[PDB]
């Protein structure tokens, strides 16, 4: 019966990445600025890759006993992270840059899971938790530095 | 400001179609039958593919000029095609299949689109719109088989 | 029920693509000419690629509903084109090239098809049908261009 | 002019190999099984692999001095193997079952052969013809393992 | 004789499209802006492309029974695209962005080239001339989107 | 002379995964199910993955100054996993289902290392061993899913 | 019923090959000698090939009728080839040279088989059994050539 | 400034490259002798070569200072190798053999420039300007062996 | 601001890397030993991993917040690791071992690290630090039989 | 001592495959012919293969315990294969065709030699040796198939 | 003892290549601007490229009797070329431009070399010498176009 | 009927260099030493490498208008290297080290054939011919560090 706890948070990850998801096909679709032809393949290259995190994310809970839930109505409604509008252009000078500002939070959930994990008793999903920290750190480094360094 | 004919229906399988996409998701993570692990495969090798075809037919609609979609609420609304609950097993001996009634219906959607498109003069829509009714029939073709065939 | 129109039809090609098939199999073996090597890899690189619009020809009839056939009574009856005697040699200056007059056929035939399915509303049909006749169409350009031009 | 023996017995087998070849290719084309994508893989890649046998053994006879035929006549004719109806289903728990007594026959054929290679000095004929047993012994015993050992 | 309908306005396309090559091969070669890199890559990622497209477009007329042409003569003088002078930068703010104004006109006179394929009975045409417009039609909405969407 | 420790552990699992080693080239060997086909290629494809952690598990041995055995003596004897008879079909609805029953209590036994190791110091040991958990708890996962979930 | 003969031997082979196996991955994990880098990925190289040879030649026995063993207790007492000590070093100048002096017998097993097989009327067994002894032949003149020639 | 030297002649050989280059694109689209397939893929395999030639030998201006062109005005005037007209046949037994007379001639342009370079300083270019004469030397080999020897 | 910590000892094994990078390079050059031709493509093998292994590294820093340096002064400096001399052979029966000694102590360095980051809560520091030891750790293993055991 | 029988014999073909060789690599030096291309890569493809025919049938030397050769006073001695002069053509329609009447001798040497491995009980030698009959066989149809069948 | 002319120089650019070397890492680690992914990816193509030069460079020393040093003393020292500082930006509108201004000056250096080389008789070391000019001119070419042309 | 200056001196070479290939086969054939495993693919390496500038350097001469010879009988009289006996060991201490004292002299050869290509005005000789220098000039640095360096 046991392991609901970091279990249940799966979820909260597993929501909020098919949003980053969509959100990504969305600067990949919509995008239209100067560096473009590159701006279209990194998206790509972003949302192909959560894609393949998204999925283990979601075999992490089959591991244990739990069963996935890939419903849309659990989405957007679980995740930590919101829809984009229809934007106004590929960057943004403000706070919020989603490109920037979005893997940003989801490492505080997961900093914040891996704990609980780190503590539970479950190497085997923290082994791959903190697989995905690495994954997503760089991707955010690579886009502060489409703006500018600073944290 | 023309052809927004055609284009506003490929909103309609657009939207349809990343319904399909996370319900295979769905088949393909919560799966528990005798068959297993090739039906572990072969969902993913469809949703894998009506990926591709999730991605060109959003880019349709920026070949002409219009600025595609990528957000939820038109999605779980938009779409001619509904969520799979948390199932029963793989395989459904009853009238609705999914896993075989669901490429069914996108098959008329488009079947209806094709003739508008073979009027208002876009053979570039129907090239490739009439492309995926061939990649979709076959994914039809061998569902229904590992069944019944009849139609 | 419907839909047995260019159906009955596509036994018609998937017969006399057969009977194509083992006479490059048959040109592909007894050739004897001073092109040889070059005429005994192209041969190959033809009925290597009928074999394969063999099968597909033949998943478009279980796409709807039909239950191909591969009984052999039923090729040697159905086909518009016959076999080759054990020949003479590669080339042939009269009137009958088989290996130039065997696929100008069987375009016809398709020709004649397409315009059924330029009718009955099948799409799917003509979109790989009609991809075959560019598939043969070259490969008539290609043969009438080791004798020569015309037509 | 010697060598008749052994070689018009290849006509034998090169007549009953393009019988089990299509239907082979039925097996393929209609199947409606559990199994089915598996059994509809495995098929082909025997009908594609008794493909290439199919050629070299034509060419053993070329070897020589023999010409090889290609008339279908002379298959439906030389044949030790007769075609399948359209079925019933894949598998089949009675004594033939074609996907398995198939091979078995041909194995006899050859076996009967091989000796007669295996005395008129023909190393060569026999260092393919043998070469092909090993080949067809595996897909022997494969198949008799869907269903049961025995033998 | 037939057929010189649609054929000779191949010409039409098979001489504008060596002039849309060389300036393409000439906007690769002189470019000298920012995104450089990328823009160096991609031109030649459409030069060679139109490269392909200028062959069978070529071999589209052999089909039939016409004699393709290479000649220089007649390029600068049948095509409806003229020569890039030796420019000023890479991108152009103005009306005409031949980097973006190019694809743009041929995608009419194929456009209006179908119709008489979509007329004369040469789905054979069609097939590929259409196949074309899909072709350029992705290459037209990737560059106005280096710059702005409009139409 | 230090780390014994989990080191004498290491021949633990060591000896007990070449046990479930050629238990697996039995699954695979013997094996006469319906499946067949996939479970043939599965299995291969299991121990043909625990191959490599036996090698690179006995290589950790001599990363610090152990010196690896090899012995099977110390096989059939050290390990906490014991043979499989000659079977009665593939499947097994009692509790043990080996190809399930197996890698559940390595899992254990791992389980009990790693703390070790996660004390001891010795983040080398536990980034592979606690690397093994994932890659061995996908295979529980995948098993008892050709069965039920529970657990 | 028949074909126990050479069959039962495969057994004495089939056993004495996993000894030989699991001492190559002794030779393999503690080595330690000048050459060392090499002697490190040749033997390797052995096991890993004899590997191939072990699965096969327990798929002949399947072949027939014959259920294969993967039992180890079967392996420690049919083969008539022993294990290696925990050595002395990679090479020895006396006679036993296990990487050397292994090999060497079990061609004789099997030359031994080979003309019981070259009876029999077992075409399928020996053109593979006698497949392995040009295999492993090599194996042995390569090994006896890091020392030295002789027989 | 300085370095027009053997700057200008780069155009020179720049502009008799094009010309080759579509004479090359005519005589592997109107080709019909006996040979064909060969001499269709061949040809192809030639001005796919020196279309590889032409692009780097335009790098090496922009290499130094100089802006390369791509206006065919600068083509059909200043190179030193015409056009072919619609030809009669793929060979030609009289002096000039297009096929073999047009390499002939450049190989003397630029072993003419090559000694230029071999003076100026320009290392770099005659690195690489030499290069493309061993490149195009086994071109003219290949041929006249065509036909036959002599110089 | 915060995380200066095992930041800032990033930059002492990032120093210490490109020290036994170069000495490896040197290995690699002046290299003159019986083995040679392993011993010449393992040293490139090490240097050009532990290449891989100092650019990372470099981005663990950008990762945070901070910003790498390149600079020498700050090598030869800041490294617990020094050069070798122009050496006297490959081997060396002595203590240091270079090729031996050298991972050694990095190996301690990031040991001690670890912990730190085994404390202020960078995992993702962490997961690939000590993937390094993983790294290196078969890097001195491997060495250490080129010579002997002991540790 | 034993087995200088079928040893002392290889060198017999040993020193014919080299003459061949060479012979091989003068045909595809001089050769001057219409078909020219090809006949220019199939013999290279032939050479090619009987070099890697040359390597092993010395190492089967080896493989027993003699030591092969590799002077060559010892092969245009040893040979029953003479050199070609520097020809006139590529074809020759009298008797002796080198590029057809050398495989075919050899044939019969070996023809010779495989009966007394059919008897000293080198099943070893035999199946490489009759492996290479086959071999060399095809490449014999092949080219008497340039000219004309017979035998 | 011969030889030592332009070896010594070798070492001067030996030298100055592994300073181009780190700085072109310092380019590629703190990389801040809008192209950013492009000049991150492209820095990276010229130091892993360079890379190569330096190796090889350093074997043309071993060529002739020369050994090689890997001591950073003798770079920072040797070198013509200098560090950068931890820079304000990617691009650089001022005289220097590293990035541009870098490769500029070892083409002069070894400008300078190869004369010495074009007389002391060593076609080896500028073959090779010479064949970096090309390797690096191109590079030069390439950066001072995402600024400006002139020189 | 100019050339024959550097051309009969290719034959000096094109003689030589089949004499080093077969002496290489030869060290490559009896080879009995300790590094063995090694020097049994690093021969087989350089032999391998000759072979390809074998030919080429025989299709220098077609390039001109000579035609290469291939007989036997004008290589062990024209070569300036001779034949090694059935050896002792792999090494030598002594002189000459066949391994190491047989590159070494065609480097002068052709050093000296370069000068007169150096005069002639043949770039395209000498870019290949000193292009083998290079190659060459490894193969001796290599070989020459098996044992010690000098030189
Ligand atoms: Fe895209
Ligand atoms: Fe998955
Ligand atoms: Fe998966
Ligand atoms: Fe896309
Ligand atoms: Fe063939
Ligand atoms: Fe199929
Ligand atoms: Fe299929
Ligand atoms: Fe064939
Ligand atoms: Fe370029
Ligand atoms: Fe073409
Ligand atoms: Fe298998
Ligand atoms: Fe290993
Ligand atoms: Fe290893
Ligand atoms: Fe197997
Ligand atoms: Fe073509
Ligand atoms: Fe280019
Ligand atoms: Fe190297
Ligand atoms: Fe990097
Ligand atoms: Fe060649
Ligand atoms: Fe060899
Ligand atoms: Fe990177
Ligand atoms: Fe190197
Ligand atoms: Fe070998
Ligand atoms: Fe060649």
Redesign the interface.
């Known amino acids: 019966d046991d392991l609901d706890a970091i279990q249940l948070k799966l979820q909260e990850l597993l929501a909020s990445l ?2 980053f998801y ?2 990504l ?2 600067i ?5 600025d ?7 393949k ?1 998206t790509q290259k972003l949302y192909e890759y959560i894609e393949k995190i998204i ?1 283990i994310v ?2 992490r ?5 739990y ?7 659990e ?2 409604k679980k995740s930590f992270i919101k ?2 509008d ?1 934007e106004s252009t590929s960057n943004f000078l403000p706070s919020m840059e989603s490109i920037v500002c979005s893997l940003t939070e989801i490492l505080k959930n997961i ?1 914040g899971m ?1 704990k609980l994990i ?1 503590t539970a ?1 479950d ?2 999903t ?3 938790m ?2 995905i ?2 994954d997503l ?2 991707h ?3 886009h502060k ?2 703006l ?4």
Chains 1, 2, 3, 4, 5, 6, 7, 8, 9, 10, 11, 12 share one sequence.
């Open positions: 098919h949003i969509s959100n096909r969305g990949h679709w919509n995008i239209k100067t560096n473009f032809f590159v701006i279209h990194k999925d979601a075999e809970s089959r591991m244990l006993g069963d996935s839930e890939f419903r849309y109505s989405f957007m829809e984009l229809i900093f891996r780190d008793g190497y085997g923290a082994n791959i903190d697989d920290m690495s750190e760089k955010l480094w690579m530095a489409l500018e360094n600073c944290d």
